[PDB]
Design a protein around this ligand. Sequence first.
Ligand SMILES: Nc1ncnc2c1ncn2[C@@H]1O[C@H](COP(=O)(O)OP(=O)(O)O)[C@@H](O)[C@H]1O
Lengths: 70, 51, 593, 593, 478, 228
Amino acid sequence: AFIILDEVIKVTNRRVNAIEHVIIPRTENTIAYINSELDELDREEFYRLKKVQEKKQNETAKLDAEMKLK
Amino acid sequence: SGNREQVFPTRMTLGLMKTKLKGANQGYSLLKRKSEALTKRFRDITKRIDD
Amino acid sequence: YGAIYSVSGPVVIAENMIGCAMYELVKVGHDNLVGEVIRIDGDKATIQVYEETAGLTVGDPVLRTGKPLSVELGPGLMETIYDGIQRPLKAIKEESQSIYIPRGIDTPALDRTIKWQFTPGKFQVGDHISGGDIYGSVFENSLISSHKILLPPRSRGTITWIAPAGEYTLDEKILEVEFDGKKSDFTLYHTWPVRVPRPVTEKLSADYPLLTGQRVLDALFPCVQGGTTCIPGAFGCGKTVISQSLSKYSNSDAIIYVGCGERGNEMAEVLMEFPELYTEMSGTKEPIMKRTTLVANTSNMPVAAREASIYTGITLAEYFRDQGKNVSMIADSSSRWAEALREISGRLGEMPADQGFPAYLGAKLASFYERAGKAVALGSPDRTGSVSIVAAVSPAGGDFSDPVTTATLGITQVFWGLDKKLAQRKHFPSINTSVSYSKYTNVLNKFYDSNYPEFPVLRDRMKEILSNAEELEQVVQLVGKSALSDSDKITLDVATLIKEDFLQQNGYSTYDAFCPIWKTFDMMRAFISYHDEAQKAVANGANWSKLADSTGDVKHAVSSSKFFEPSRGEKEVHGEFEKLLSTMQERFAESTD
Amino acid sequence: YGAIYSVSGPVVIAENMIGCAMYELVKVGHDNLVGEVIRIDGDKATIQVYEETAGLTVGDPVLRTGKPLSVELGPGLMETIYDGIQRPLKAIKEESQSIYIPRGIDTPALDRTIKWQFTPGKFQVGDHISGGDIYGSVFENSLISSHKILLPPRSRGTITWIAPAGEYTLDEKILEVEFDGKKSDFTLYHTWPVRVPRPVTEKLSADYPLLTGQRVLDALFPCVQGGTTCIPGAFGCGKTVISQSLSKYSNSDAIIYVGCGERGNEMAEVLMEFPELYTEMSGTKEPIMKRTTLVANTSNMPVAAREASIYTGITLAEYFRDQGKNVSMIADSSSRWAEALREISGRLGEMPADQGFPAYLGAKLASFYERAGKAVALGSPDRTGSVSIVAAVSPAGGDFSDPVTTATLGITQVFWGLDKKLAQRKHFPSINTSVSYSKYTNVLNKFYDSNYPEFPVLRDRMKEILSNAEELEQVVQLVGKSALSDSDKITLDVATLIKEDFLQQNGYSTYDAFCPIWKTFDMMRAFISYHDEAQKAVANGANWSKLADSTGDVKHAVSSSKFFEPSRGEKEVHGEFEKLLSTMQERFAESTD
Amino acid sequence: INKKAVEQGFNVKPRLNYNTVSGVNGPLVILEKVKFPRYNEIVNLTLPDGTVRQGQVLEIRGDRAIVQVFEGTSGIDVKKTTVEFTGESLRIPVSEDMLGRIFDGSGRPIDNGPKVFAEDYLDINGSPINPYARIYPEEMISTGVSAIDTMNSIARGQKIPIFSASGLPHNEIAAQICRQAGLVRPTKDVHDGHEENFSIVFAAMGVNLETARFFKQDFEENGSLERTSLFLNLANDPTIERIITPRLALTTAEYLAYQTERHVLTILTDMSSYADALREVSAAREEVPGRRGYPGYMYTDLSTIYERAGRVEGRNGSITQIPILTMPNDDITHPIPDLTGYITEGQIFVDRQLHNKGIYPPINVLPSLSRLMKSAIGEGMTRKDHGDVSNQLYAKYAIGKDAAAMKAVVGEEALSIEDKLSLEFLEKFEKTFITQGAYEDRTVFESLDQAWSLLRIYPKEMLNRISPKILDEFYDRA
Amino acid sequence: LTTAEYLAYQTERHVLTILTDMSSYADALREVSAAREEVPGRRGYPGYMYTDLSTIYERAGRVEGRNGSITQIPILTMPNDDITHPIPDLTGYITEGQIFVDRQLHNKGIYPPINVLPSLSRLMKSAIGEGMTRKDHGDVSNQLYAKYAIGKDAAAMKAVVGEEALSIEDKLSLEFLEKFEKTFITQGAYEDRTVFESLDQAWSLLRIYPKEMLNRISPKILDEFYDR
Ligand SMILES: Nc1ncnc2c1ncn2[C@@H]1O[C@H](COP(=O)(O)OP(=O)(O)O)[C@@H](O)[C@H]1O
């Protein structure tokens, strides 16, 4: 029982101190850093897309208003 | 910063590591109360040896 | 004046709005919907509408109010329930006789029908008057004996006409100034923008404790009049106890409750329990609503209202601080306000910073929290107020990595760390001492040395005892009680007595509803004396188990020390504490033989 | 000619630029700020200014030169400090006595007043001279004793007049050619566009090591003269220290230290240390500043000049390669190049690829790195040089997933990954052996078999030992040192000895700042012998526990083998290492009896 | 005097004030019909209510100039707002008497005193120092902190911030450093020691009133207020103004050090607040985010701030920069500490775990670094054992931390004798060497002796990093 | 919700509103948002739906002057079975509590597969009492939750320490969990149990335990209900 309890307590302490305390930072990295950065890059790219689309449509609307005036 | 798995950050890997973390946490609690039972019996046996 | 163009939900492009300023409130449509200008482009003004926009035609007028989002400051502010836009929910209910809030409703924030008794101040005709000068007092309620009438900041001149003593409404002119030939008419109220802090002569260092009446708060994690406090706004944790103790027993001369973005049925509790909360600080039993204003926002209230709720509340608190009144502001859930910010930023399309929160969330939080604090009010006569912010953070199921929670914990000097588990075990007020902290302990050294010199030493000793028991419970669980020394058993027993007696305050009883700071100090002396006498006696060879089985009577006396009724008088309670201390010293001396 | 139409950061858009082309040098503003065209939209051409853009006005002249960004190649490059536009910083400080870099300063890149001694080459009048031909040699330094005046590439003809031996400045005519009727003049120097790599006869395969002096770099992950090396790591890992040590102690005949967007104190450091350190390579003790030229661009210096800095440095390296000199290029941080490109692209409005970097970043990196390999220089006399590009990469956050690192990894042949954890322990050079690699190990077998035949075998042995001990260490920290075989314990202890005494290199101590290849080989042999003999003794009956104590002297001896002075000479060091090996042999023979 | 005589300051220049406001968006104001806009001119905005706030042009396109407003754009009306163009980029009046004065983040005095009676209007964000004109900092300044003297040494002119988080005593450590900073081997020019004092320059960006009062009071208690110039930009002050505050502080530091030859000790507290201001501005301008929403040009701008340090060849002054930045979640990987570590020649890491253990100062030795420590220590300066002792301290501290982590899983019994020695060393180290009084000033030699006493736990044979020459001299009673 | 508002607040009815497939509504909302060229927020869902879900949810509750009331039971499918998804997260922000349907219970054949350990009714205490159902409702619910959690933990230890190594409470807890999940939680799709029938079924389940460790039931109620 001493041998079994020592092995079991060692495994439990390892899980508490290294296994879980490394899986949690790994998950934290994955989601909070990288998924957020990928979503942020998608946000920036789609916002740049929207800016291009709006400036193009605004130029078209300005041209239409000008030829209506003329 | 801290120990790392150095794994491929994707949604599939995020879910994989969340499942792994939950499994490891429940295994830690499981072995903790197993060890509680074992050390209770161990203290009992130590008393038997002592007397 | 103006007109309308592109409408996509609340964003409403206007026309012919040449004279509109940025962040200026406007009346949109024939229903006079409220909205603030977000962009200006020539004669076009981007207006975000502060409510539903389903029916809006192109070309119908948009009238510009000329002012940013501002709150009407004056009498009638007490005992009133508002939203973020300071719409009087009660007055809306009786005026419309309606279950809902009608769209485009424009009832005045402050009641214009009530006639208030006005007593003019020291200023006479021809006197130079400056912003913040008290030129009159108005008997608002019995708790607010004199709602002093402040001259609005940024306004000054020579007093040309001042109304005599009488009874007046808000619309009636009260005082008249001339600045440089230009003539201004001042009335019983004034409007101040919510997003600019109310100016003060000097921001003093907050150094007088905020006596909440709870032993754990007043002793271990003390806040300060003009301090800043953060709280976890979870469900099971007894945060209602904290809010009711601050609004019911604290030193505050005014209470501002800001229910920003709360649930529908939670605001129901907040609005229904407050009317029956009563105080004895006035010497007569009176409701706390005579001293408290509620800002109530269910989650379906407009995003602009939810975002501006905390600013409205803090502006009201600043207004009451500028009168010399210590005011405490309680935010129901600042995380809901941050959610409102995230929605606003998303609808404006601003690039996010941390999983959707805007880049200025930390800046906005810091600027808002800096508005709190003790300060000498602007103008004369000399007076000192204080605004204490007690804000609760409720992230996604305890996810305290939220940037809102991170910024709040980085700004607030006090964290009272309510715990779900301590509420499960019915250990009210359920303060998790392990995680809770207070950074105002150093500042309150002046107050303690002036009044209760031994208070910091006893507080640190109690901290050490509880921490030692907390770190020793693991070795107990792992090894067994037999491995513990006698002094460790002393620490465990005294700490358990502390948890069952001092930290745990019934609150709903009569002896524990309000534990004054002097009674708290007496109890700290009692508990620390018990621990010290036990430690000394056992260090003198005495076996701790024999003393524990023998000194249970003094332990019971210490246990019943929390039953001492504070209403019996400070002198009487101090005398009985002295008798308790003498008895415990004598009995320890006998039992150590 | 043209006039500024828009200024936004380093990017300036100039109108009336109808006649200008892509990547053409243009003088911007009344200060003649240097920049190049990166876009044309009709008559409006975007320009990335290479100097500080603050203060530019619309309407000021933007002169267009017609030539691309060209670097002057000739005598005077060596022992010189340069900026990105190859403006001599020493001459800038002398001409403008201010301690700053005045914007728009136009110092000639190479000194036009020094009279260089010119010895004419093997070519005489009437000979057909082609690009890359040496038509003379010039005494530049005592270390670079024959700076060979090449004919400019892309130019050829028949020699009409050649200057006899004497002293000539860079503006004096030296050679006169006749291509097909047009007669051209040549001087000590010639300009070359920094964006077109200098032509070579043929790129040979690099097969001679770039002995950098670092034990781990020379042994486990060797680079070759003509190789491409990446050194990615977080701040404080020590990539600039490795780069500087390479510049001081490599077997290169020339060094081009490019401080691409790094702190200026590093440039001050190299400027104040290099004249104090000497090499015997030229045959006499001579300072390494005579061998090193710099291109300095501090991180606060203009952003686009950062991009120009690598290109002027690599063109200088190519020019010295064309003279048959094994020149090594050190880019202090190419990630700063990448951030410069990202900033310029963000100003331009281009759609990003990843982490904001432009979609063409990988192409630029590959094109820059491909200019490295050993090659036969153009023209005659036949000669061979090399360009060892050793570029440190600074990934954001220390993560090798950074786009700059990812792009560079697929381009370079050597990857000296730096570990932040090892650097924090001050275990420099902190190469992450588990991830670092070199693809030149197979090529270098030809060198090893001729010089150190057992070097690759012992290198593989040490890598096996380190990998085995790494997996052993993770297993142990999961389960504990128990149940380990004595062979496993020997592996762990030997790898700890390696990590602490062979991979360790103090870099600033006299004994081990530079570890010559023979000393590194001897240390490799001694450590492998210790491991093998401990393994054999324990396998042959003995037990590791008492063997470690009974033979601690030999372990301390191999620990102290790193304290051998390289200045004692190869003969003395090898003799003492053989003495160490024999002593270890006899001690392990006697202790296992 | 003739160098000072040439001024051309009497040339008055009328200013074009424009009513041609076109658009306002976020903190940006757009003006049309601007006659020859300069790229980076300062403008003054007369708002309809009469208040005048300060602006700066960020972009010009023909007749339009994009202006950012430091104090925000609230209340700006196209019809009434008038914009006056100063004609030159931002400048601050500077003088030696400007020491001892308290300022906002925009340079306006708030000590209830006079405006700056200038000697020169130095251009803001001054040009970079010529790398040829620099002098490598190798003059140790003894900060009295053993965690920063024996290990992580600072030399005069070094950039070295304090890495910390919200709640840790970073600003107390900074106050101590400014309190007891001094050369290890002072010039000893005179017994008065007037020029031996550091002329502090303090910039506060987005700090609560409590921290500003703490720094002001601490400078007052030590008589340093007569030598320090404060630039206070509190939490309630405008956020766009946080950008120029460190620029003003570094401009005055440059004036004091490289023009009046004063050994300036620049303190820039809450660099993370400056970072947040930069992020807010960039998100307003819709520029490309580098990482975690921060601008791609964050590294360049932060370096522009930091690199205004060091000392120059012919000038006997120096700017020793010690910023303080709040790590958002104790992460080095965060962009604010990452880029700063890439720029600033080292960092003094304040540790939360050490702070919770009651250790003051909670300087975590391993994450801390001092790049130019290597040349500020040795034989001629400090002691010949300094480098080897520091390296061995680092190695043994790392081994002790690793052995404590091992004990956390395999128990104390399973540890080897070396691991037990390492735990002993770590405990004594943290509690008697890093642990230092808030007002205790340890000379580098006292800290070296304490380090040797700690190292004597191990027998001489396992001190492998220390060279045998040093080890056979200092291990036996020094 | 307009119909429910009309009925409850003008006809004075008690109205229950079941909004099934709230996740499908969220998908539709995202489609509408992207139709207006709005850039998607978190997880592709637009960032403003906390407001819209709030407008849907807050159209409930009982009011001062009207005897009617609105009770809402939104039903949303968690995509990939996580709470961190925007839809369940926002619904948890706006709504009081949640009922959980568990896949593990569903695979065992239990209907309804309601996992009661995670499910919570925040303001359940207001629905239970003397004039509100029965005086024993709250403490019987608490005891059921406690014994169910203990039974799950004991089922974890059943395969780790063995059946015989469990404590007597754990041996009772295994069979209590068996009877609970497959008789009390397991209710037919057309079996209508009134609150009192469900309460006395819960009592019949709780009658296996002894007096000493039914500790989360008040001794007055316990001594009035458990002992006969
Ligand atoms: N091989 C080495 N030997 C001794 N000290 C080193 C070594 N490498 C780095 N260091 C120390 O660590 C610091 C590393 O800084 P640096 O080389 O600039 O790294 P990075 O460029 O990645 O920030 C140096 O200033 C030096 O003091």
